[PDB]
Amino acid sequence: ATPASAPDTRALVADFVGYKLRQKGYVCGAGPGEGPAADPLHQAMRAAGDEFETRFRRTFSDLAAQLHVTPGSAQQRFTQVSDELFQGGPNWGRLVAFFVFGAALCAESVNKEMEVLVGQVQEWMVAYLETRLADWIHSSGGWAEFTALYGDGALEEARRLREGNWASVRLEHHHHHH
């Protein structure tokens, strides 16, 4: 018994984006309350998103000013940061982090009619995914671990961890003695 799949990974992506766009302008959908779904793809995607948004408080205004001062590049910068730390870290913390970025920088580059660069950021994503992320993914299989990851447990833990190592961009210089 091995079910098949017609849709594509790309489709799911454009879905979260397009929906997030109308979510502010013209919401369109249904009201899932007691409708058990085999593949909690949608529910899952929303969970992660709202997870980081609920975990902290004002990541937008906060991460805005804070990350503002420190000279940072565009979208490409956000990813580079995540991959920089996640470099060999199959932790969930980087999931909720790297995600909040792709999305935020997604709707931004999209709404601003900056799709040109948008398609670029994503392309790179799926690239490294099957490149070096093909292992950590093959182990858990994918969202599988995610579905059962945030099943039960304080969220404040996942954030503090993510914003902990990430926001911990503050380190100590070197000591030059003679």
UniProtKB/Swiss-Prot annotation:
Record keywords, A-Z: Acetylation, Apoptosis, Membrane, Methylation, Mitochondrion, Phosphoprotein
Motif BH1 boundaries: 84-103
Location within or outside the cell: Mitochondrion membrane
Name under which the protein is recorded: Bcl-2-like protein 2
Family label: Belongs to the Bcl-2 family.
Gene Ontology MF terms: channel activity; disordered domain specific binding; identical protein binding
Alphabetical list of PANTHER family matching this protein: BCL-2 RELATED (PTHR11256), BCL-2-LIKE PROTEIN 2 (PTHR11256:SF13)
Tissues of expression: Expressed (at protein level) in a wide range of tissues with highest levels in brain, spinal cord, testis, pancreas, heart, spleen and mammary glands. Moderate levels found in thymus, ovary and small intestine. Not detected in salivary gland, muscle or liver. Also expressed in cell lines of myeloid, fibroblast and epithelial origin. Not detected in most lymphoid cell lines.
Domain notes: The BH4 motif seems to be involved in the anti-apoptotic function. The BH1 and BH2 motifs form a hydrophobic groove which acts as a docking site for the BH3 domain of some pro-apoptotic proteins. The C-terminal residues of BCL2L2 fold into the BH3-binding cleft and modulate pro-survival activity by regulating ligand access. When BH3 domain-containing proteins bind, they displace the C-terminus, allowing its insertion into the membrane and neutralizing the pro-survival activity of BCL2L2.
CC terms in the record's Gene Ontology section: Bcl-2 family protein complex; cytosol; mitochondrial outer membrane; mitochondrion
Pfam families per UniProt: Bcl-2, BH4
Gene behind this protein: BCL2L2
SS bond list: none
Predominant cellular place of this UniProt entry's protein: mitochondrion
Span of the signal peptide: none
Motif residue range(s): BH4: 8-28
InterPro entries per UniProt: Apop_reg_BclW (IPR013280), Bcl-2-like_sf (IPR036834), Bcl-2_BH1-3 (IPR046371), Bcl-2_fam (IPR026298), Bcl2-like (IPR002475), Bcl2_BH1_motif_CS (IPR020717), Bcl2_BH2_motif_CS (IPR020726), Bcl2_BH4 (IPR003093)
Top-level division of the source organism's lineage: Eukaryota
Placement of sequence motif BH2: 135-150
Keyword Acetylation recorded: yes
Function per UniProt: Promotes cell survival. Blocks dexamethasone-induced apoptosis. Mediates survival of postmitotic Sertoli cells by suppressing death-promoting activity of BAX.
Any one GO BP annotation for this protein: negative regulation of apoptotic process
